[PDB]
Symmetry: D2
Subunit: 386 residues, 4 copies
Amino acid sequence: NYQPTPEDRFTFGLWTVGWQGRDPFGDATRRALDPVESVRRLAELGAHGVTFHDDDLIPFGSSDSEREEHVKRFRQALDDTGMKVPMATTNLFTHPVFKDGGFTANDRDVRRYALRKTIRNIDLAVELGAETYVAWGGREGAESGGAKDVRDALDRMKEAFDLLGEYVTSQGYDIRFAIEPKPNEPRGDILLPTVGHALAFIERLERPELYGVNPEVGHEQMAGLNFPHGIAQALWAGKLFHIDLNGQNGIKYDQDLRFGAGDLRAAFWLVDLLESAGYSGPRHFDFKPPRTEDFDGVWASAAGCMRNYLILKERAAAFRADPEVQEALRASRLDELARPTAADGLQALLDDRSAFEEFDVDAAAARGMAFERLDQLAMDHLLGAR
Amino acid sequence: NYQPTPEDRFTFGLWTVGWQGRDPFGDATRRALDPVESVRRLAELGAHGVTFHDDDLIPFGSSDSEREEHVKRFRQALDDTGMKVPMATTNLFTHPVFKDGGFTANDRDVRRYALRKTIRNIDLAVELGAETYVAWGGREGAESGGAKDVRDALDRMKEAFDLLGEYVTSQGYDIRFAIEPKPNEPRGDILLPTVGHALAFIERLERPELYGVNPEVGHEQMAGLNFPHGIAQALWAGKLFHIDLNGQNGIKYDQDLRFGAGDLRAAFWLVDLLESAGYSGPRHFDFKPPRTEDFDGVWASAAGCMRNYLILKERAAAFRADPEVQEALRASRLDELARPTAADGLQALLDDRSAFEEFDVDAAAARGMAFERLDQLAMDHLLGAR
Amino acid sequence: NYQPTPEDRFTFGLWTVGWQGRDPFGDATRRALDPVESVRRLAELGAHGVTFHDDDLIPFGSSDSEREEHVKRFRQALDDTGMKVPMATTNLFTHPVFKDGGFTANDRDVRRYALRKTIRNIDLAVELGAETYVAWGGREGAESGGAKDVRDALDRMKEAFDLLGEYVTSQGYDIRFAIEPKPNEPRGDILLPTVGHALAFIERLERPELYGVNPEVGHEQMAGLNFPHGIAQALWAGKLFHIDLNGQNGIKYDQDLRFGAGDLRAAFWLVDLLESAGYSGPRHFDFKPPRTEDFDGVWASAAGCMRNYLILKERAAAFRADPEVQEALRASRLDELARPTAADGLQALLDDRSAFEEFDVDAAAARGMAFERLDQLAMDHLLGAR
Amino acid sequence: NYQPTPEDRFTFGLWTVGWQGRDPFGDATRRALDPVESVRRLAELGAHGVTFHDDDLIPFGSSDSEREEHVKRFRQALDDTGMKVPMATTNLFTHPVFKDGGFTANDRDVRRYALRKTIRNIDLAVELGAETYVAWGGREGAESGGAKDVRDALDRMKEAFDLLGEYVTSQGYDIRFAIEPKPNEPRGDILLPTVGHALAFIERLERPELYGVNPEVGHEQMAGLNFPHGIAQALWAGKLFHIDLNGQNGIKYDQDLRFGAGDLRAAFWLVDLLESAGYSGPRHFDFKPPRTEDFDGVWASAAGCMRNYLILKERAAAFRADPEVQEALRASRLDELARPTAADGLQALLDDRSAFEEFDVDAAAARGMAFERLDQLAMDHLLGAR
Ligand SMILES: OC[C@H]1O[C@H](O)[C@H](O)[C@@H](O)[C@@H]1O
Ligand SMILES: OC[C@H]1O[C@H](O)[C@H](O)[C@@H](O)[C@@H]1O
Ligand SMILES: OC[C@H]1O[C@H](O)[C@H](O)[C@@H](O)[C@@H]1O
Ligand SMILES: OC[C@H]1O[C@H](O)[C@H](O)[C@@H](O)[C@@H]1O
Ligand SMILES: [Mg+2]
Ligand SMILES: [Mg+2]
Ligand SMILES: [Mg+2]
Ligand SMILES: [Mg+2]
Ligand SMILES: [Mg+2]
Ligand SMILES: [Mg+2]
Ligand SMILES: [Mg+2]
Ligand SMILES: [Mg+2]
Ligand SMILES: [Mg+2]
Ligand SMILES: [Mg+2]
Ligand SMILES: [Mg+2]
Ligand SMILES: [Mg+2]
């Protein structure tokens, strides 16, 4: 079993299966892929769609006429395969002009160029049917303390996103923005380094309803944070617009392993949350097939992303459906966590002698939470020992 | 030089110099301090004031009459010394009843008790003149994925803070709340683990203007994050209500070293930011004298906190005042970062051929940022080699 | 299935199920256990044996006569249950006298006391039949750079272990020593912080054959290291004398979760290695039932340790036995890794034009390693999807 | 002041100032440097010498005749400047053929090629006068557990180093080997990941006296370890043959900042140790000028490396020479740490009732260590406040 179909909404970036394997210490180990061949191969594996940076699809520097030819060939492969394009993004990190950032570069003329390069691709994204436009400010940041006044940089970041929201509103486009946090790499520290920082920043934009987050498994784990907790907070705020799925082994460089590798139990709890909460966006894989692999390994790695999601989906569903787990959840008072603390209101709480004066603190303290039995039931389900 | 006076607004928690040195592997190495003696000794060192948890000042379980005696003796030492109490907080972590949290415990009766214990201390804090009430949800969190539904927990957390804001508004108190994030320890993962997560959560409260953050140097460094960057974002949002100063050597257990130890360059850039931005709140030290020390070492460690702040203040001021640094800041285009990207507006930007069609991307890319020369000037200033 | 029996050699420290739940921020949540009751309960769960620190079994300060009574009652419970005692250790960390270390304390009289306290327990360990004596130098280390000259400290550490080896040799005891590394906590940095540092240090002892390592899953993961790789290096050196099994979620305080929690894939590869290499020592759990739990949760957590080991043992065995995995291992050239690079010798290698002058570097470079297919077969086996 | 001269023995790799700024997310920002121009510029700054990989000096694939021309031009620049070449190394990581390692690649023919490529450069290194040959096994490792049997890989690693020792012995060369550890990047985990693992491995080689370590500041800090402690252990073992100096901000990708940046207090304690212990090898900088910089920034960054070493040398010397620090060191019993624990021997220790039966454990426990006063004196010296 565990066969994906387009209805599972699995998507991949062109830059994922197309990563040629150049890393900071080594040359490329694979030839470049034509975007048309990636679309065709991914469709055969059961993917729903692809995503792109402007510069993945149109080589930097292309003339308007080469640009039209590149888009036309791409559109033909989408039509031939039934593949969709649900998200697009801008490359504001590879070209040397962006070495100190795009939206927050110290040079004003670079910031203006960054905005114009972005706006050009938003038009293209809308034409291809994308619903989400992602921004990853990978060069926005610093290696040293005096290089960047962060309050001024956040003013420039707000200014840029405000202008993009003005642009989409005045064009009447039906597209929303998602900010993708990352704590470091390639800059020593990156601005808006976690889900939380990005959520807080969105609330200071002029039109906050147009902006959400695009969290990545590996990025929050590069700060040692619990990725399902961060996703829960994004869902609670109503801001999970898109998600990047992959694997990471702890606090180190961004590995972008296939989804399911890295922290397997966190992948289980993530899938449990996304499915329980009814997340209906794309399940997007931002991963790199390791540079040890040839092209057969690339497609095996991509297939593995989808397979692991579907296995974990089955295990999480079996967990939540198990009557014994339902009993254990009540034993651990998960039902009580969902009930208001004081629906009776402040005055009733202040007048309630059972909440303080007569509260038996020692009897409450002696109650075990039964969390270890619950967690072993979850382990047994994950391993198929139930 | 480097002598503190009460005008520098240095404050200390009772639990800092009073830490008896019990750690998870060892017994206490120091006897308990009477709060009155800590107030007297800190005043002699030049401190401005002290802070407290309810249970530092009034032993848990005290009768209303013992409670009055404890507060009266404390007030007498404040009157005798001129020491202030600018901040107070609640202990919702030591007693076993709080083993699964206070505001987000799964048991509803514990959550109600947590709120009543808090409200009782807010009254006391106002009576002693505190302007900020800190909340550190050290037990709010989980060791395993099924133990805590985080969306329900955030509902309970919002409910608790909303009720506290209703309480202070209806009493007419002039006190604000500050949430203190920490990513982990003593729970495996703690809810609202960073400055950013706390800032985002505040924007969903019913009266957000009453709530800010109380960031701690060491806590953001336990996630590998840049503490001055996080403080800059808190200042940008207008939410830096209080701060906890200490030192930490990287990603490990919360060390709470004296301020200046740990990451010294980050301490320099923090002081530079606080002084430049005109932060006028207390400079509060949340630190633990190591359990190797006797009481003479306790007071040396506390004195060192203040000394290091004043040395770094002098060095940061000399840095910003140095004409050569002013020249270097312009060389690195810090002045241009502070200028709007597009004060001319969206349409002018779209019509500006110098922002895209005629932009010379190769010439812009060749401009060096001169950040390494600027950073060596900052190093020279820090080390007193300028 | 997955029922342990004494033949699986699962052992537990008295301090594990007996941890009362005191952490740096909270009081104990469980009453103390009598060592006799822990022995009885563990035997009912299928354990093979228990381990102890001197101070777990004999309260610190006991008279020689109380000491005999404590040992006699303990021996009676071992006789009644059939439980063995394969390992023992000394507590050189809890008492305040050890605040700057035992073997490497700066005070010479403390170092002498530490040695005498150790020697007294080696006699007891031999009397109870222990084959391994573990040393965990949890207080050997420093919070600041000038407090400890590390070369002098390593001289003192070598001196102490040399004297212990002289003691066991002159008494004719059949016991070996195992050093347990940990990188930090409770000291800011601990001497011999990893498996590698401990292995290197052993080679400078006077009788290296008497000393090996006792690595702990969570400790190597507190440095972000790969625990199965470190165990492989300890096996390669012939020095894996004992092992501590538990779980840890990344780089943070020492969590001591039950085995199987934390990094589940690393637990799978660890079990694969131990079973393949024929490790025949005790499978020892050094874990803490979380302080959320009552005593029913303690025993569930302990049972879970053993269960997870036996599930992973089954999955790793099914992986290695699967013909398709055998085919994939050959596809990835694991067979070639096991063959000597140059059994023909140096001169033949220098004369072999196919190794350099005529080596087709581009054809070799194009060969994919097929590691992603192999790793997905391992995932499928772990999850029971094969 | 703080002007370097060739007598300070500062050296730089050709690949450091010559790094073109290509990172995993971006193109090069600087043109390639001719090795002859780097030698000339470094000599003007006061450097002592340069180091190289084979492929930095001779482009991969060069004919024997182009090879001679490249070496001749290089030798002429050394003669013209007086620059020395104290260390050389092999590039076994950039070419795609090395994607699964050099000495421990699964393919046997790649391992043989790796050895031949190394041996060819050892001859060249000896001809240029290098005394140390460094090996950094950056590709030796794995992203997944089944890809590499680590015991077989360590057999292949021992085999390769044994063959290199046979080669240098039979040629009569006066060159020693130094292994450079790194825990990860570019492989997910790298074999011999820390100083300790490398020291332990050397003791299993056939001729251990020919092998030492070349530790790098940033690499040990990528595992959160204390770099001066690791250097002390390497000095204690007599194995510090060479050192790589740079800066790193905590646990993240390898930043290779200029020396003095990153953890400044650790740089102070490192310099204190190297100078106190009389390390007489090269002070080698393995650093990357950030890709924000133009060539003027490159040379400023290199100059900063040397400047910061000389400032810290002055501060550490003033610390050790200060009578008040000498008094504090005795107060903290550093003198007693240097005295044998039991020069009187085992029997005398066992017979000494003052070591146990009559030892006053409470009085010893009450003695403070005075480490915080000592550490503030060290801070005051570092900051020039003494
Ligand atoms: O912006 C989309 C993608 O851009 C870059 O490739 C980043 O490395 C990746 O994290 C991000 O998701
Ligand atoms: O709530 C005030 C203090 O409470 C606890 O002591 C925490 O450990 C500390 O971080 C916090 O600042
Ligand atoms: O020495 C045996 C045990 O001692 C202490 O309890 C440590 O916390 C543990 O890691 C170690 O294994
Ligand atoms: O081998 C010498 C150098 O090789 C590589 O460039 C590594 O990145 C560096 O760490 C090492 O020191
Ligand atoms: Mg990533
Ligand atoms: Mg990414
Ligand atoms: Mg991404
Ligand atoms: Mg803290
Ligand atoms: Mg704290
Ligand atoms: Mg605090
Ligand atoms: Mg542990
Ligand atoms: Mg442990
Ligand atoms: Mg242990
Ligand atoms: Mg490096
Ligand atoms: Mg390096
Ligand atoms: Mg190096």
